[model samples]
Target: DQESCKGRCTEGFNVDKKCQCDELCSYYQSCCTDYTAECKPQVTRGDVFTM
Candidate 1:
Protein backbone atom coordinates (compact mmCIF):
# COMPACT_ATOMS: atom_id res chain seq x y z
CA ASP A 1 0.00 0.00 0.00
CA GLN A 2 1.33 3.43 -0.99
CA GLU A 3 1.48 5.98 1.80
CA SER A 4 0.42 9.60 1.60
CA CYS A 5 1.38 12.83 3.34
CA LYS A 6 -2.01 14.45 3.52
CA GLY A 7 -3.15 14.91 7.13
CA ARG A 8 -0.65 12.36 8.37
CA CYS A 9 2.24 14.77 8.08
CA THR A 10 1.79 16.03 11.61
CA GLU A 11 0.35 12.85 13.01
CA GLY A 12 3.83 11.96 14.33
CA PHE A 13 5.08 8.43 14.77
CA ASN A 14 2.30 5.99 14.00
CA VAL A 15 2.44 2.21 14.14
CA ASP A 16 -0.22 1.98 11.42
CA LYS A 17 1.75 4.02 8.88
CA LYS A 18 4.08 2.37 6.43
CA CYS A 19 6.26 5.51 6.65
CA GLN A 20 6.43 8.50 9.00
CA CYS A 21 6.44 12.29 8.67
CA ASP A 22 7.78 13.30 12.02
CA GLU A 23 11.17 14.71 13.03
CA LEU A 24 12.65 11.30 13.74
CA CYS A 25 11.48 10.10 10.35
CA SER A 26 14.32 11.91 8.63
CA TYR A 27 16.94 10.28 10.83
CA TYR A 28 15.28 6.93 10.38
CA GLN A 29 14.84 7.48 6.65
CA SER A 30 11.17 6.57 6.91
CA CYS A 31 9.52 9.80 5.91
CA CYS A 32 6.82 10.01 3.28
CA THR A 33 7.50 11.42 -0.16
CA ASP A 34 6.08 14.83 0.71
CA TYR A 35 7.37 14.91 4.27
CA THR A 36 10.05 17.44 3.39
CA ALA A 37 7.66 19.68 1.50
CA GLU A 38 4.65 19.32 3.79
CA CYS A 39 6.15 19.03 7.25
CA LYS A 40 8.43 21.58 8.88
CA PRO A 41 9.80 20.41 12.18
CA GLN A 42 10.00 23.19 14.76
CA VAL A 43 13.18 21.86 16.31
CA THR A 44 15.03 24.17 18.67
CA ARG A 45 18.80 23.94 19.02
CA GLY A 46 20.75 25.01 22.07
CA ASP A 47 24.19 26.58 21.84
CA VAL A 48 27.10 24.35 22.83
CA PHE A 49 29.96 25.66 24.94
CA THR A 50 33.46 24.21 24.98
CA MET A 51 35.31 24.24 28.23
Candidate 2:
Protein backbone atom coordinates (compact mmCIF):
# COMPACT_ATOMS: atom_id res chain seq x y z
CA ASP A 1 0.00 0.00 0.00
CA GLN A 2 2.86 2.40 0.85
CA GLU A 3 4.53 1.73 -2.49
CA SER A 4 1.55 3.22 -4.27
CA CYS A 5 2.06 6.54 -2.50
CA LYS A 6 5.81 6.75 -3.22
CA GLY A 7 5.17 7.73 -6.82
CA ARG A 8 4.20 11.28 -5.91
CA CYS A 9 1.96 13.50 -3.92
CA THR A 10 -1.50 12.40 -4.93
CA GLU A 11 -3.16 14.26 -2.10
CA GLY A 12 -4.31 17.41 -3.82
CA PHE A 13 -2.87 16.08 -7.04
CA ASN A 14 -5.51 16.46 -9.68
CA VAL A 15 -6.53 13.55 -11.78
CA ASP A 16 -7.46 13.69 -15.48
CA LYS A 17 -6.96 17.44 -15.19
CA LYS A 18 -9.90 17.59 -12.81
CA CYS A 19 -10.33 19.17 -9.39
CA GLN A 20 -9.72 16.83 -6.49
CA CYS A 21 -12.15 17.37 -3.68
CA ASP A 22 -10.84 16.57 -0.26
CA GLU A 23 -12.80 14.17 2.01
CA LEU A 24 -14.50 13.09 -1.18
CA CYS A 25 -11.46 11.31 -2.54
CA SER A 26 -9.19 8.52 -1.37
CA TYR A 27 -5.78 10.10 -2.16
CA TYR A 28 -6.55 13.60 -0.92
CA GLN A 29 -4.00 13.36 1.86
CA SER A 30 -1.12 13.67 -0.58
CA CYS A 31 -1.72 17.34 -1.35
CA CYS A 32 1.30 19.64 -0.92
CA THR A 33 3.74 16.82 -0.39
CA ASP A 34 6.73 18.63 1.12
CA TYR A 35 7.97 15.35 2.48
CA THR A 36 9.09 12.58 0.20
CA ALA A 37 10.62 9.34 1.31
CA GLU A 38 9.73 5.76 2.14
CA CYS A 39 12.16 5.26 5.02
CA LYS A 40 11.27 8.24 7.18
CA PRO A 41 13.36 10.74 9.28
CA GLN A 42 16.45 10.24 7.15
CA VAL A 43 18.76 11.77 9.75
CA THR A 44 18.41 11.23 13.48
CA ARG A 45 20.33 11.23 16.79
CA GLY A 46 21.12 7.52 16.58
CA ASP A 47 22.37 7.90 13.02
CA VAL A 48 25.83 8.92 14.26
CA PHE A 49 28.01 5.87 14.72
CA THR A 50 31.67 5.11 14.01
CA MET A 51 33.21 1.70 14.35
Candidate 3:
Protein backbone atom coordinates (compact mmCIF):
# COMPACT_ATOMS: atom_id res chain seq x y z
CA ASP A 1 0.00 0.00 0.00
CA GLN A 2 2.99 2.32 0.63
CA GLU A 3 6.10 2.90 -1.46
CA SER A 4 8.36 2.59 1.62
CA CYS A 5 8.24 1.16 5.11
CA LYS A 6 7.31 3.39 8.04
CA GLY A 7 10.15 4.21 10.42
CA ARG A 8 12.25 6.96 12.00
CA CYS A 9 14.26 7.43 8.80
CA THR A 10 11.23 8.08 6.64
CA GLU A 11 12.34 11.45 5.23
CA GLY A 12 11.14 14.13 7.71
CA PHE A 13 12.16 12.23 10.83
CA ASN A 14 12.52 12.55 14.59
CA VAL A 15 11.87 10.77 17.90
CA ASP A 16 12.68 7.13 17.10
CA LYS A 17 15.86 7.42 15.01
CA LYS A 18 16.30 3.93 13.65
CA CYS A 19 16.23 2.22 10.27
CA GLN A 20 13.49 -0.38 9.83
CA CYS A 21 14.75 -2.03 6.60
CA ASP A 22 14.42 -5.47 8.28
CA GLU A 23 17.73 -6.88 6.94
CA LEU A 24 18.49 -4.81 3.86
CA CYS A 25 19.23 -1.42 5.35
CA SER A 26 22.41 0.39 4.35
CA TYR A 27 24.50 2.92 6.26
CA TYR A 28 24.60 5.20 3.24
CA GLN A 29 20.79 5.56 3.20
CA SER A 30 19.66 3.77 6.32
CA CYS A 31 20.99 2.79 9.78
CA CYS A 32 21.92 6.40 10.35
CA THR A 33 23.77 7.66 13.42
CA ASP A 34 23.77 11.43 12.98
CA TYR A 35 20.18 12.35 13.60
CA THR A 36 20.99 16.07 13.85
CA ALA A 37 17.70 17.11 12.28
CA GLU A 38 18.67 19.52 9.53
CA CYS A 39 17.47 20.65 6.14
CA LYS A 40 18.87 19.00 3.04
CA PRO A 41 18.10 19.32 -0.69
CA GLN A 42 16.48 16.12 -1.91
CA VAL A 43 16.37 15.51 -5.66
CA THR A 44 14.19 13.16 -7.65
CA ARG A 45 13.12 12.42 -11.27
CA GLY A 46 11.19 15.70 -11.22
CA ASP A 47 14.40 17.68 -10.52
CA VAL A 48 16.11 16.53 -13.71
CA PHE A 49 16.19 18.67 -16.88
CA THR A 50 17.19 17.80 -20.48
CA MET A 51 18.38 21.30 -21.22
Q: Write the per-residue lDDT of candidate 3 for residues 1-51, one digit (tens) a residue.
A: 223332433354332544433223343465434333322223347867532
Q: List clashing residue pairs in candidate 1.
A: none
lDDT by candidate, in order shown: 0.66, 0.36, 0.37
Candidates sorted on TM-score, descending? 1, 2, 3
TM of each candidate vs. truth: 0.53, 0.19, 0.19
Q: Output the worst ten-in-a-row residue range by lDDT, candidate 2.
A: 32-41
RMSD of each: 8.4, 10.0, 10.6
Query: C-alpha displacement of 39 in model 1, angstroms?
Result: 2.9
TM-score of model 3 relative to the true fold?
0.19
Q: In model 3, where is the ten-residue run with the lowest total lDDT? A: 34-43
The list of candidate 1 runs beyond 4 A from truth reads 42-51
- For candidate 3, the per-residue lDDT at 23 reads 27
